[PDB]
Design a protein around this ligand. Structure first.
Ligand SMILES: NC(=[NH2+])NCCC[C@H](N)C(=O)O
Ligand SMILES: O=C(O)CCC(=O)C(=O)O
Ligand SMILES: [Mn+2]
Length: 341
């Protein structure tokens, strides 16, 4: 189908035009599950430089790529076939960029789960990814202010949760299809407020729009994982590669906070006849923030964002050294402590 494309203002102030744009973003998510935002020359330049750094990294030998791994943070390399979605291996190779915290940071010294330094392959790759994520973050903040305005909420409702937010990025290369298996990544939802994504010309991303009457699992609950759900049921919309745009769709936290007025968009990736480069950026609450229902003030349910992130990454990577160290040191119990002390 034909997605909507919007140009965002550089600053969002709450004027009538901003409110109108927020209404339109919500309506596009409610109809299509996704929309596109137009990139300017610097946003595009930084996207292309990130893609170029990714292509150069993936040409390195596996031993080198596999050395870019940490037992403190999930940042770093994921080999093809290493990640699990709904009990099945996914086939991209990935470099994950989480908040880059040295062992001098007090949260790292305290052993907080998932906190530690990015194992950058080199400093040029570091600069390219950080510069790109700075731009992605500015867009994320614009989008969150617009979304609040569209729901007639105070403009800072969501940005109040994203101060020092746990923003992160997956830098992906999908191999060409070389076996009978076409599955790149299984159907799933991502975990935070927004997913902002870029792709090259190859194509392979599919998203599921809202469907009237279709129950959607609440992926923050252990008995309602969204992984694998609807994988072989229509409808799925192909996200046609388009120059000069990023795509945007909601993550789990927006589904929870809006009581399902927005849905965390299910999506999957199919391998193509050529390798495919993409970057997915996650604009997230602070690790210590608790999401809450916006439209039910008496509702007691909350999502501790860092707990959700940690649970998800442990399920993605059950055998990774990062997960082993969480288990060995009982870092999930630390997470319980950091909530109160
Ligand atoms: N870290 C991610 N966002 N992974 C996206 C794929 C789905 C993930 N393997 C899961 O089971 O939920
Ligand atoms: O390949 C894409 O375009 C998006 C991949 C994705 O959903 C992810 O890495 O979470
Ligand atoms: Mn995803």
């Amino acid at each position: 189908t034909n997605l909507q494309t919007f140009e965002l203002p550089t600053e969002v102030t709450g004027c009538a035009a901003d409110i109108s744009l927020g209404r339109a973003l919500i309506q596009a998510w409610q109809k299509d599950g996704i929309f596109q935002i137009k990139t300017d020359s610097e946003q595009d330049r930084k996207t292309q430089e990130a893609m170029a750094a990714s292509k150069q990294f993936c040409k390195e030998p596996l031993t080198f790529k596999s050395s870019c791994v940490s037992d403190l943070t999930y940042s770093g390399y994921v080999a093809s076939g290493e990640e699990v979605t709904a009990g099945k291996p996914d086939f991209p190779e990935i470099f994950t960029v989480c908040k880059d915290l040295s062992v001098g940071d007090q949260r790292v010294k305290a052993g907080w789960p998932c906190h530690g330094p990015v194992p950058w392959p080199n400093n040029t790759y570091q600069k390219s990814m950080k510069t790109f994520m700075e731009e992605l973050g500015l867009a994320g903040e614009r989008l969150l202010k617009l979304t609040a305005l569209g729901f007639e909420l105070p403009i800072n409702t969501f940005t109040d949760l994203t101060r020092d937010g746990w923003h992160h990025m997956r830098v992906l290369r999908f191999p060409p299809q070389t076996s009978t298996l076409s599955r790149g990544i299984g159907a799933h939802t991502d975990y935070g407020l927004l997913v902002i994504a870029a792709q090259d010309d190859v194509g392979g991303l599919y998203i599921r729009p809202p469907v009237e009457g279709e129950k959607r699992n609440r992926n923050w609950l252990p008995g309602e994982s969204s992984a694998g759900m609807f994988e072989h049921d229509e409808p799925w919309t192909f996200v046609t590669p388009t120059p000069g745009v990023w795509t945007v769709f909601p993550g789990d936290i927006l589904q929870f906070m809006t009581g399902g007025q927005l849905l965390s968009t299910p999506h999957k990736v199919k391998l193509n006849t050529r390798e495919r480069f993409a970057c997915a950026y996650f604009h997230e609450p602070n690790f210590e923030a608790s999401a809450y229902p916006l439209f039910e003030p008496s509702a007691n349910e909350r999502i501790h964002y860092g707990e959700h992130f940690t649970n998800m990454f442990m399920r993605c990577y059950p055998d990774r050294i990062t997960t082993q160290r969480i288990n060995k040191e009982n870092r999930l119990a630390h997470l319980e402590d950091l909530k109160k002390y």
